[PDB]
C-alpha cells in the first residue's frame with residue numbers, strides 16, 4: 001500500500017530530525033545509499049557519484065564502537081536490494097562472502113575486503129588515523145570517510161553488462177543508450193530510490209512506464225517493487241520503455257537522431273511533456289519537430305523544456321552515451 | 328538526487 005509507505009516515510013524522516021536535527025537529515029536517494037542503525041544514532045552513506053563512503057555517529061556513549069560496526073557491516077554487506085529497508089533503522093542481517101563493495105574499495109594496504117578480519121583492521125586504521133569531529137550546534141558527530149577506487153563506476157557497470165547485452169538484443173535498443181541512462185539515473189546503484197518513486201538501476205516508476213511496458217508484453221497490472229529491485233528485470237523493463245517510447249509514443253518523429261533526443265527527454269519527463277514543448281497537438285508537435293534539424297530539437301529541449309531536471313537530463317545522457325558508444 | 332512520500 002502506497003499510503004502506508006508514505007506514512008512510514010514521514011515517520012522515518014521525523015525520527016532522523018529528532019536525533020540529528022532538521023539540518024542534518026540525510027536520506028537515501030537514487031545515487032546515495034543511506035542506512036540508519038543504532039536507533040538512528042549511526043548512519044552509513046555511500047555516495048555513488050563521488051565515490052565516497054561516509055560513516056557517521058551521534059551516539060553520546062562509545063562513539064568509536066558504533067562507527068566500527070557500521071564500517072565493517074557496510075564494507076561486507078551483501079548485494080541484496082530486495083531485502084534491506086533503507087527507510088527503517090532496523091539492522092538487517094546483510095553479511096556476504098561476496099560483498100557489494102568488493103573491489104570498489106580497498107583498505108589501507110590497497111587490498112579488497114571480503115572478510116571480517118581485514119574489514120576490522122581497516123576499521124581500526126580509520127578510527128585511529130582518519131577520525132573527524134564536527135558539531136550539530138548541540139552534539140558532536142563523529143565520522144570517517146572512505147574514498148572508493150578511481151574506477152569504482154566502471155566496476156559497478158561491469159556487474160550489469162550481460163543484462164544490458166541481452167536487453168539490447170531483445171528489444172533493439174543500443175547498449176550505449178541503456179548504460180547512459182542507468183549511469184545518469186542511478187550511477188549503477190541497485191538500491192536506488194527516488195522522491196518521485198523511481199525504482200532501481202534504470203529508475204522505473206511502476207504506475208507510468210512500468211505499467212505501459214506490461215501492456216506491450218501482454219500483461220495487465222503493474223510491475224512490483226520486488227520485481228524492479230531485481231537488476232535483470234529492472235534493466236529489461238527500462239529497456240522496453242525506451243523501445244516503446246521510440247516505436248509507439250514518439251514514433252511520429254522521422255529523424256532518428258531527433259527521435260533519440262525526444263526519447264531521452266521523455267524517459268524522464270513523459271512523452272507528452274516532450275511533445276507539448278512544440279505544440280499542444282501531438283500530431284502537430286511531431287510535424288513541427290519534423291521541420292527542424294536534430295541539433296535544433298536538441299537545443300529546444302535543453303533550453304525550453306519546462307522541467308530543469310529533464311533539461312539537464314538530455315545533456316547528461318547525450319554526453320554519457322558518447323563514452324559507451326565505442327567498443 | 329537524494330525520500331519517498
Ligand SMILES: *C(=O)[C@@H](C)O[C@@H]1[C@@H](NC(C)=O)[C@@H]2OC[C@@H](O2)[C@H]1O[C@@H]1O[C@H](CO)[C@@H](O)[C@H](O)[C@H]1NC(C)=O
Nearest residue numbers: 030185194195196198203204267268269309328329
Ligand atoms: C536524482 O539524482 C534523480 C535521479 O532524481 C530525480 C530528481 N529530480 C531532480 C533532482 O530534480 C528528483 O529525485 C527523484 C526524482 O526527482 C527523479 O526524477 C524522476 O526520474 C524518473 C525517471 O525514471 C522519472 O520517470 C520521474 O518521473 C522523475 N520525476 C519527475 C520529473 O516527476
